[PDB]
């Protein structure tokens, strides 16, 4: 072993909501735990989440976790795993109340209970009247949540490795994950974090697109790491485009704007969502709203200006008092990034890439899955995933607003509650040899030695442009096929890309180059998966196969990294506490 | 502790403000300053007492203040303790010299 070895029971890679909630739980169960993060923990993308946490607290009106389960299942367009959605919806209220006891500064109803607002895809009585179940701290709920979880980690003295960049998983000769190599950004030191449980919690990958709501750090590192270790990823074609990014900037304005009573207008001042979703209107599922906006624009009914083509999000009728109390953050964002005061004028908006429904398939315990040669599920010993990197799947083909933060907390906690059993079930794992660790350094040594190759900047730009033109809200077979060919070429250029800064003290160029590898793998998996799924379902929408096809495609898509090919996985439709929700036509 | 310093500085600030108003009051309403009226002012019990009370206030107020300054800009302990010594000594000398000047009038 010619690299330093740091050993823990558990290594959690990522300190957003999911990773911080998991670390806190793992630590309180008596296991040693190392929490890694490539930025200071409270700079994780969770910190930007706005609208709130969707959960059946029953504060704003009497509610029922089964109503939430129904909304989620339907919202997912029937490929969300119903046993997993049931666990999440039923467990949710208590898991969220626990955050409030940790001091999360939720907004409040008059009787002192947590404030909940309406949000997309919420109904009472299994598809009835609009519901209000998204618990909020104004519109900075992600900020409140992340800071609270960090505070709890200080209180608990969690071992945190801040500004360490995980490079690649380490496998032993039996095919088990036994930790990861990591790079200390400050000093340039390279280390092997050895563990019985390695927990990916690395977040999403919106930066594979030209325009995204996501932080610069959202580069799909856990997808690249899984893929390079032979671990499959699931449903990667399922990308949520949030209906309301600011046009021309990408920056999100929360769906809480529509939850509080705002709505979308086209250039004729028509409230068009009444036409596209007569029941739920502006609070329909996001895949539907996003498509409807793009249909208006495509058909000459969008607005234009300094911002580019867009729809108008009108809020002024709510008044200054409601806006400043419920939506202050979007007041700042709109003023700063659109030069528009929402108190007086509509915000120019357009659908913008937002959330990765896909990821590493997992059990509710967080254990990662692969398939054997027979196509059966088998646990990947030593590997776990929680949060946006995971595909449990509770989100299927379209995530509901507020259900990601609920996911981070419910599943981050579950991985930690179940960790001892998961470790006992997998048995003692053989040690990595030095060559096993060495294999995890190949990618890094390539960059450290390549001075004369290609500019990584043009490669990143080409990759983003390809995804934006070819794998956006509306897709087509021919365009996707070409897109895929273009990515193969770009991926070849990337193998000869140069690192121009070779220094060791806080060298961010090296980190950005390593991230570029993970953008490439994520983009590649996404494109292969989108080509493969010949139907339209939730966020995946194809002109050549415009219909939802339950006979062939009521299932998950799975990308197999060793053959670079696709297969299908069963959707779970066997909840324990109530009967399955049968697939039906999905309209809002 | 810190609360104690904060209050003392402010309590003495109030006493010195009154003393300044008193002294300025005199100066700006006494025409020609003859030796006679000058010494009559400082011979008064009221002026003597107030001036000594001001002097004690200064000892307290300027000590805390100078300690604040030194603990910001002078790190080497020995140098700092030496400067504090000179400063306390000077303040105590101010008071004692004041006692000597007024009790001599």
């Amino acid at each position: 072993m010619k690299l330093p070895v740091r050993e823990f029971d558990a290594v959690v890679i990522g300190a957003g909501g999911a990773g911080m909630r998991a670390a806190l739980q793992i630590s309180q169960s008596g296991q040693t735990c190392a929490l890694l993060s490539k930025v200071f923990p409270t700079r994780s993308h969770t910190v930007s989440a706005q609208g709130g946490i969707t959960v059946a607290l029953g504060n704003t009106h009497e509610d029922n976790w089964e109503w939430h389960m129904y909304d989620t299942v339907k919202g997912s367009d029937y490929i969300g795993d119903q046993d997993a959605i049931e666990y999440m919806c039923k467990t949710g209220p208590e898991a969220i109340l626990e955050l409030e006891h940790m001091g999360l500064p939720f907004s409040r109803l008059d009787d002192g209970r947590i404030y909940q607002r309406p949000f997309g895809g919420q109904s009472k009585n299994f598809g009835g009247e609009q519901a209000a179940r998204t618990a909020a701290a104004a519109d900075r709920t992600g900020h409140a949540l992340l800071h609270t979880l960090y505070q709890q980690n200080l209180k608990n003295h969690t071992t945190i490795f801040s500004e360490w960049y995980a490079l690649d998983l380490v496998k032993n000769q039996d095919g088990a994950v036994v930790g990861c190599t990591a790079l200390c950004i400050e000093t340039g030191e390279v280390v092997y974090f050895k563990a019985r449980a390695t927990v990916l919690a690395t977040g999403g990958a919106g930066r594979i697109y030209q325009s995204t709501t996501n932080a610069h750090i959202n580069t799909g590192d856990g997808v690249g790491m899984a893929i390079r270790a032979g671990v499959p990823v699931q449903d990667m074609e399922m990308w949520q485009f949030h209906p309301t990014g600011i046009a021309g900037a990408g920056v999100l304005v929360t769906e809480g704007c529509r939850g509080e009573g705002g709505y979308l207008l086209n250039k004729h001042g028509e409230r068009f969502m009444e036409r596209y979703a007569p029941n739920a209107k502006d609070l329909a599922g996001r895949d539907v709203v996003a498509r409807s906006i793009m249909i208006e624009i495509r058909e000459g009914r969008g607005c234009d200006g300094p911002w580019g083509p867009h729809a108008k999000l009108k809020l002024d009728h709510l008044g200054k008092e409601v806006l400043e109390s419920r939506l202050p953050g979007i007041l700042e964002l709109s003023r700063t990034f659109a030069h528009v005061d929402p108190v007086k004028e509509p915000i120019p908006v357009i659908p913008t890439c937002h959330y990765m429904m896909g990821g590493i398939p997992t059990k509710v315990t967080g254990q990662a899955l692969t398939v054997n040669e027979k196509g059966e599920d088998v646990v990947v010993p030593g590997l776990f995933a929680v949060g946006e990197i995971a595909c449990v799947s509770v989100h299927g083909a379209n995530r509901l607003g507020g259900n990601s933060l609920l996911d981070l907390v419910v599943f981050g906690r579950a991985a930690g509650l179940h960790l001892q059993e998961s470790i006992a079930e997998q048995g003692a794992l053989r040690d990595a040899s030095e060559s096993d660790v060495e294999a995890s350094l190949d990618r890094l040594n390539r960059w450290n030695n390549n001075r004369n190759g290609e500019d990584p900047v043009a490669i990143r730009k080409a990759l983003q442009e390809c995804m934006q033109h070819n794998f956006s809200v509306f897709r087509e077979g021919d365009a996707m096929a070409k897109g895929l060919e273009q990515l193969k070429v770009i991926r070849e250029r990337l193998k000869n890309a140069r690192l121009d800064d070779t220094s060791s003290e806080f060298n961010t160029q090296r980190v950005e180059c390593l991230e570029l590898d993970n953008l490439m793998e994520t983009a590649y998996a996404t494109a292969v998966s989108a080509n493969f799924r010949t139907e339209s379902r939730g966020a995946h929408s194809r002109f050549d196969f415009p219909d939802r096809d339950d006979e062939n495609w009521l299932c998950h898509s799975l990308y197999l990294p060793e053959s670079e090919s696709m297969t299908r996985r069963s959707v779970n439709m066997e909840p324990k506490l109530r009967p399955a929700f049968p697939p039906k036509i999905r309209t809002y | 502790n810190g609360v104690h310093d904060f209050i003392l500085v402010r309590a003495t600030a109030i006493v010195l403000t009154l003393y300044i108003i008193y002294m300025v009051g005199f100066f700006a309403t006494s025409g020609e300053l003859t030796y006679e009226v000058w010494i009559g002012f400082f011979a008064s019990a009221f002026t003597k007492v107030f001036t000594l009370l001001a002097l004690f206030s200064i000892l307290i107020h300027a000590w805390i203040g100078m300690w604040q300054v030194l603990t910001d800009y002078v790190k080497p302990l020995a140098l700092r303790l030496m400067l504090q010594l000179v400063i306390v000594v000077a303040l105590v000398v101010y008071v004692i010299y004041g006692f000597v000047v007024v009790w001599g009038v």
Binding site: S48, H101, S503, N507 | G2, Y73
Partner: protein, 238 residues
């Protein structure tokens, strides 16, 4: 239109001491970018230029910098606010902290002061609520202006008291966080917390210099929070 920059450089394996290096950037005349945009482009042309950033929307607190003399966040500072005819736009690290590399500072002391004031809910478990703690809107309003802090350190690294005693003065950001727990009606350890803030340095090194308020990118007011702490300290110890 040509933008001119002077940017602080430092790499310990190369430089004997920090230096300023000049950069030029051609920009579109009809568009106003953020400083972070400009930095990102300078790095396309000089891959060695290192700085922190993430959210690019003023929420994460990553990219605090001293810009033309004044702390703020690069992501929401328009170039038109910095660009003065015939002068260079001057970009330097937040003052007072050790510089790791280029524009990246070691925030260690800033975080240590935050941990010192025990920034987490302390509730003694008596009279537990049935579900969430009940907190009326009037009690919850008291946290507005305090819980929004993004820990960017623009305030603390602009405070002279924090420069002279970064290990004893808590600093504006830390004290804002202390006050956040002090007036949270769900925190029951108010008296313990005030007892830990009574020394000469933790709170009382604040002299109302007001550098903190003028630079906060979120519009928060540490000076006022600090005032309220001083009052509570008198109320309890005077």
């Amino acid at each position: 239109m040509r933008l001119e920059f002077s940017i602080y450089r430092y790499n310990p394996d190369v430089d004997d001491a920090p230096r300023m290096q000049d950069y030029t950037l051609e920009a579109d005349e009809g568009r106003d970018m953020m400083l972070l945009d400009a930095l990102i482009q300078l790095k396309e042309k000089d891959p060695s230029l290192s700085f922190r950033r993430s959210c690019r929307e003023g929420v994460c607190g990553s990219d605090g910098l001293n810009m033309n003399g004044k702390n703020g966040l690069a992501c929401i500072t328009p170039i038109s606010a910095l660009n003065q005819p015939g002068k260079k736009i001057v970009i330097r690290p937040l003052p007072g902290l050790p510089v790791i590399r280029d524009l990246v500072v070691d925030m260690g002391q800033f975080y240590a002061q935050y941990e010192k004031i025990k920034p987490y809910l302390l509730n003694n478990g008596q009279n537990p609520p049935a579900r969430e703690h009940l907190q009326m809107p009037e009690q919850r309003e008291k946290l507005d202006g305090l819980y929004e802090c993004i820990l960017c350190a623009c305030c603390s690294t602009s405070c002279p008291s924090f420069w002279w005693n970064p290990d004893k003065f808590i600093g504006p950001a830390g004290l804002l966080a202390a006050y956040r727990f002090l007036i949270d009606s769900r925190d029951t350890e108010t008296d313990s917390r005030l007892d830990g803030l009574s020394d000469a340095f933790s709170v009382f090194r604040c002299h109302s210099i007001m550098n903190c308020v003028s630079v906060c990118p979120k519009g928060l007011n540490p000076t006022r929070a600090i005032g309220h702490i001083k009052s509570m300290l008198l109320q309890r110890n005077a």
